[PDB]
Amino acid sequence: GIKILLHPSGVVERCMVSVVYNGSALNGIWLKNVVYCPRHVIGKFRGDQWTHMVSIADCRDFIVKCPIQGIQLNVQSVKMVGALLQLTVHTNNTATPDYKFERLQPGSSMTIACAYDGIVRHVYHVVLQLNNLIYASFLNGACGSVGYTLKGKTLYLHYMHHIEFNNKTHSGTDLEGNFYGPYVDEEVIQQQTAFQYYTDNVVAQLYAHLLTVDARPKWLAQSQISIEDFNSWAANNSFANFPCEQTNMSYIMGLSQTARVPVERILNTIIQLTTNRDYDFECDWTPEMVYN
Amino acid sequence: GIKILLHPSGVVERCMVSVVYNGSALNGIWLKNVVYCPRHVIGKFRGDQWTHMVSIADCRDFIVKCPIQGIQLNVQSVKMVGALLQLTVHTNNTATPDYKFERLQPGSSMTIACAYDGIVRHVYHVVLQLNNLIYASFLNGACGSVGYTLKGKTLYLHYMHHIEFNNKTHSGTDLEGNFYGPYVDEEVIQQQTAFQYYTDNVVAQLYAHLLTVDARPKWLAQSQISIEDFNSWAANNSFANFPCEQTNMSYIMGLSQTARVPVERILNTIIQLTTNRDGACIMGSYDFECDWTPEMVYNQ
Ligand SMILES: *C(=N)[C@H](C[C@@H]1CCNC1=O)NC(=O)[C@H](CC(C)C)NC(=O)[C@@H](NS(C)(=O)=O)C(C)(C)C
Numbered sequence: 001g002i003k004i005l006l007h008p009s010g011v012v013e014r015c016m017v018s019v020v021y022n023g024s025a026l027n028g029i030w031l032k033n034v035v036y037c038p039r040h041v042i043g044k045f046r047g048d049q050w051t052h053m054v055s056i057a058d059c060r061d062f063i064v065k066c067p068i069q070g071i072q073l074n075v076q077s078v079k080m081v082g083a084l085l086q087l088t089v090h091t092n093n094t095a096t097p098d099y100k101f102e103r104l105q106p107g108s109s110m111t112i113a114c115a116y117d118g119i120v121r122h123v124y125h126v127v128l129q130l131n132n133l134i135y136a137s138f139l140n141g142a143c144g145s146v147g148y149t150l151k152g153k154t155l156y157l158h159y160m161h162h163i164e165f166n167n168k169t170h171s172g173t174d175l176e177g178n179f180y181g182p183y184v185d186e187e188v189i190q191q192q193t194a195f196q197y198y199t200d201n202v203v204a205q206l207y208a209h210l211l212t213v214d215a216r217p218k219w220l221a222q223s224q225i226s227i228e229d230f231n232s233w234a235a236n237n238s239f240a241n242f243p244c245e246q247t248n249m250s251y252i253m254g255l256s257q258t259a260r261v262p263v264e265r266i267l268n269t270i271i272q273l274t275t276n277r278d279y280d281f282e283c284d285w286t287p288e289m290v291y292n
Numbered sequence: 293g294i295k296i297l298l299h300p301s302g303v304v305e306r307c308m309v310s311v312v313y314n315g316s317a318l319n320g321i322w323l324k325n326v327v328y329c330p331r332h333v334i335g336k337f338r339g340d341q342w343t344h345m346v347s348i349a350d351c352r353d354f355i356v357k358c359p360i361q362g363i364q365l366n367v368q369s370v371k372m373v374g375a376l377l378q379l380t381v382h383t384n385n386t387a388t389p390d391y392k393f394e395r396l397q398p399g400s401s402m403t404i405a406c407a408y409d410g411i412v413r414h415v416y417h418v419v420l421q422l423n424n425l426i427y428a429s430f431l432n433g434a435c436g437s438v439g440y441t442l443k444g445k446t447l448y449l450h451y452m453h454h455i456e457f458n459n460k461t462h463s464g465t466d467l468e469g470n471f472y473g474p475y476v477d478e479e480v481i482q483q484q485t486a487f488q489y490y491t492d493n494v495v496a497q498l499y500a501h502l503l504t505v506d507a508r509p510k511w512l513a514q515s516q517i518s519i520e521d522f523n524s525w526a527a528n529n530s531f532a533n534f535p536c537e538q539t540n541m542s543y544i545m546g547l548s549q550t551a552r553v554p555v556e557r558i559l560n561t562i563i564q565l566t567t568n569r570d571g572a573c574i575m576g577s578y579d580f581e582c583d584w585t586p587e588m589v590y591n592q
């Protein structure tokens with residue numbers, strides 16, 4: 001079949017740690033001799049207050065424990081990198097895999113290991129939207145949970161959670177400490193990029209449907225529209241220019257032949273489904289996930 | 293947000309093994325001093341040939357390695373239990389969690405730890421359908437992959453994979469060895485009971501939509517239908533009698549209160565959508581899904 005595929009959480013689980021600082025509790029990930037947590041564990045600060053506030057943060061106040069290994073770590077030095085804290089601990093993490101800090105481009109998927117008190121409780125799937133937000137599931141104390149990818153032996157760390165916004169959107173940084181989009185870790189109103197559909201992913205879900213359900217749907221458009229004509233329509237209808245990624249073409253072209261529905265018919269179907277749509281989880285299927 | 297929640301696979305990853313027998317390779321799970329794997333690793337036998345074939349299977353031809361722990365295990369004795377083999381080994385698994393073999397009733401969900409060569413490659417979510425099949429994702433060598441859930445510390449194993457039927461449906465046994473539904477581990481055409489929706493889960497899907505995507509979608513029915521009237525319609529439209537489980541009613545009444553939409557309107561929306569849908573995308577899907585259970589949508 002064709003399912004939403006997630007990456008096994010074993011590697012992440014053994015590196016998760018709790019970070020409690022003067023009654024503020026969140027999660028952190030422990031790689032080599034460094035624990036990465038969100039900087040607001042030391043307090044709710046804004047703008048450029050963070051530098052001075054971190055320098056006065058006492059190291060012995062960082063209560064850091066690793067539940068899977070039953071070890072309590074001790075911080076030797078605190079360094080703010082971007083909007084994250086790099087806590088150097090005396091112990092090297094024996095379970096550290098080959099890892100990489102890789103930034104995501106919007107339209108890409110990743111597995112969230114949502115943790116509490118340093119223990120991964122749930123695992124679910126998200127795609128970074130063109131507004132640079134994920135639509136996730138988080139409660140108090142979940143900051144520090146990471147969104148990751150796996151390729152063989154190597155853990156690809158992509159996301160660390162920081163903020164939940166009023167419309168159940170979620171923002172965070174990469175593991176370098178830089179946020180996705182213009183959002184910051186401050187409890188104030190923050191303007192959001194207007195939503196836009198990652199067209200490549202919408203095309204992937206429609207093909208996934210024609211490959212799993214039995215008969216061609218009656219709402220599948222009968223006439224095809226040119227890619228060029230779709231992109232003129234897309235500019236005025238909150239859809240990203242197609243293709244969003246040139247490398248997705250090989251996948252989409254392969255789906256088009258397995259399903260025997262030209263991509264030009266899929267795009268006209270998207271346009272004709274406009275009355276139905278007039279955010280709603282259509283960009284969760286990436287072309288690579290559907291094709292492989 | 294309301295999401296499809298999966299159980300962290302780390303416990304299962306530490307117990308997966310590879311089992312290779314004279315050219316046939318699949319996975320197994322290693323709990324205490326026992327390795328459980330599908331029986332067809334020894335051959336593609338039918339009917340009542342299994343008792344004899346297993347009895348004459350050489351314990352030395354069982355190559356059993358646990359990759360994440362670097363161990364290669366050695367098989368002391370083999371014993372068939374249902375359609376599963378129970379391979380006793382010299383070594384105890386120190387990573388063995390507190391576990392329980394629990395059989396699933398239809399309409400309940402589990403996390404599939406999809407494995408190859410003893411390594412979990414993917415992790416996804418399925419629900420046992422009323423045909424006792426799961427709509428999963430498997431290729432060669434995936435047999436022995438398990439379905440599981442977690443209640444805090446205990447590992448609840450429900451499923452082990454055996455078969456793929458051509459409609460991309462999958463079948464297997466519980467960890468006791470007995471299949472779900474009338475399917476068996478043979479490469480023959482096997483009659484499938486016609487598909488029926490798990491109405492509780494379809495109701496949970498539409499409620500998930502009201503609570504995260506759009507509180508008042510244009511396809512939400514305005515009038516309601518009684519549970520009784522729906523069940524009369526359901527008997528002729530491949531929807532199970534509502535409710536399929538009486539215990540879902542506590543969750544369903546809760547979702548109704550927070551969504552302030554009585555489930556009678558949800559049931560009438562199900563009936564209207566079988567003629568009115570026209571490609572509407574509900575909770576991220578273009579058809580009715582049994583993946584959302586009331587408990588998961590309510591608890592989250
Ligand atoms: C971190 N553990 C936490 C998790 C939130 C809690 C609710 N859901 C989540 O994802 N994050 C916060 O509490 C942050 C803290 C700031 C200082 C970075 N605050 C919020 O997310 C805030 N949203 S906001 C920016 O004010 O709109 C809440 C607390 C009102 C959700």
Ligand SMILES: *C(=N)[C@H](C[C@@H]1CCNC1=O)NC(=O)[C@H](CC(C)C)NC(=O)[C@@H](NS(C)(=O)=O)C(C)(C)C
Nearest residue numbers: 332430431432433434435454455456457477478479
């Ligand atoms: C076990 N590892 C394997 C997994 C299959 C391969 C394709 N996807 C899967 O899920 N199972 C099999 O190869 C079984 C073996 C028998 C003896 C149980 N065979 C099949 O599932 C068979 N389908 S069937 C019952 O003949 O329609 C395949 C191989 C043709 C799919």
